[PDB]
A paper describes a structure:
EppA binds free EDTA, but not metal–EDTA complexes, restricting the ability of Chelativorans sp. Based on its three-domain, bilobate structure, the β2β1β3βnβ4 configuration of the core β-sheet of Domain III, and the two-β-strand hinge, EppA is a Class II Cluster C periplasmic binding protein.
Soaking the crystals with EDTA lowered their symmetry from P43212 to P212121, thereby doubling the molecules in the asymmetric unit to two; however, no EDTA molecules could be placed unambiguously into the orthorhombic structure after refining the model with EDTA in the ligand-binding cleft. Instead, two sulfate ions from the ammonium sulfate in the crystallization solution were present in the cleft of EppA. Based on the relatively weak (e.g., no large, hydrophobic intermolecular interfaces) crystallographic and non-crystallographic protein–protein interactions in both the P43212 and P212121 crystal lattices, EppA is monomeric, which we confirmed by calculating a molecular mass of 63 kDa for the single chromatographic peak observed by analytical size-exclusion chromatography. Due to the high ammonium sulfate concentrations (1 to 2 M) in all of the conditions that EppA crystallized in, sulfate ions occupied EppA’s binding cleft, preventing formation of an EppA–EDTA complex. When 100 mM EDTA was added to the crystals, it caused the crystals to melt. To determine EppA’s EDTA-binding mechanism, we resorted to molecular docking.
Residue numbers in the entry: 31 to 564
The structure:
Amino acid sequence: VTGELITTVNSGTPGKGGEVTFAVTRDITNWNVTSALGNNAVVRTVTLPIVPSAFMVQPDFTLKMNTDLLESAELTSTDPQTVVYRIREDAVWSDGVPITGDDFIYFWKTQNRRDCPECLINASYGHDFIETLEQDETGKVVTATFSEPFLGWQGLFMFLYPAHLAEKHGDIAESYNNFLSNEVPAWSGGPYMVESFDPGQLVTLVPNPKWYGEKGPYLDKLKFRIITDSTQQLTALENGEVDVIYPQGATQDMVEQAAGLDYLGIDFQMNPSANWYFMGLNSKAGPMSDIALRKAVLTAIDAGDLKAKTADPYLRNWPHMGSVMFLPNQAGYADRRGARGYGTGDVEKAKGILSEAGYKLSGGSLLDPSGKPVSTLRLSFPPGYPAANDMARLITGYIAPLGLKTDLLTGPNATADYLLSGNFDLHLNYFSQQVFPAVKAGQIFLRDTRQNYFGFNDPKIEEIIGKAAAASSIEESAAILSEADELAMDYAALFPIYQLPTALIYKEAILNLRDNPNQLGPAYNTAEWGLAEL
């Protein structure tokens, strides 16, 4: 029995001074997390200490208004939808220039798909629904007027950049695509600022002397040590080369090794991630273009065994995920996977599905209805995730009694970004869930969207997602979106499995360091990090 909640784990009041080194698994070649080329957890983690945010995702997966930056953020009308931000008078950039509506307006123009068509952004996330964005004479009152209703307005302006500096480095596209992306940032609107960068080796941050927030900074230096071999991170922690690691693919062996390092003052936190494993099926081309084969495969897979073999030996009460739009703890979640018989390990039912669609078995091999042998299936998965490798082997075994063979494919070319309608039949990977399921769903289930890898193509799903994204609460949104989850599971192109475990492994002298098991991650509150007093 503990008195810590997910939001208060490892709370304390640190001393002043010292340093913390946090391992990251990518070199920094793009400093702009909102750009397509900078959109990953490493850039997000390294720049969270310097980028101000309107709202921040908390460990309980809620959005918290940043009261260091903002006095208030209010939905003041719905006819038309209007949001008013009041920026704190004391909020300033590291050169002393006030943070103002100039910074909101610049970011909106880079993200809204209209004012800067050449900006190489990741995604608009609804910034394009803001039609006008105006500020008062003081620069501290910002009014956003929307062209249509939008649920996820608190996810907007989560990363702000210094407009007055960007303005000195070309037009909007040039400053966003070059200055803010390619250059090591000399500026900050957060508790820390970059002092030096050794490419491929080390980012060194120091306190921002003009930090305006309530807490911190406590450290003389905050360092991010680049260790691209994720399997060497626990050794670096053991050896004192870093003080914190956050590896992506935890295993039983990793947990057991970390537990054996308690004599060095190492502890760890692990929680269900916003990242969730799935198997996608190529509905656009190849054998999986037949929905009957997709449903037979999903019915034959034994999800209980999948989890029993790869999670249950070292993770207690680990939840199945039976939705492709909601995590198990989100409003609207239900086991829509099992309701359809997917994941039940029911080989005889799967064989019936195939027989009833015209498939036949000959000499141990499945024949398609025309009489041609079904090809060996290409099952790809990215490197660096031992659980995915193990599950790929297990799935091969589950479908072998159907007369299907598989070729397992991995390595650097087997990532999601490199998927093509021509190069896979089955793909094991993960998606990163967002605070607003309807916003995430619009990025992955719509016909002409990059992350629709498996070929959903249903105007009704798209209509439902649009209505859900226009709702006035997450709960209403979830009630609407549930219908799209049902239809998506009917199509059998995306099979949810279970959430990845996080693993924050660290020297316990560091206080106010806690897991934040979502895309924003543990560096959401570096202003509070410090070392306990001896």
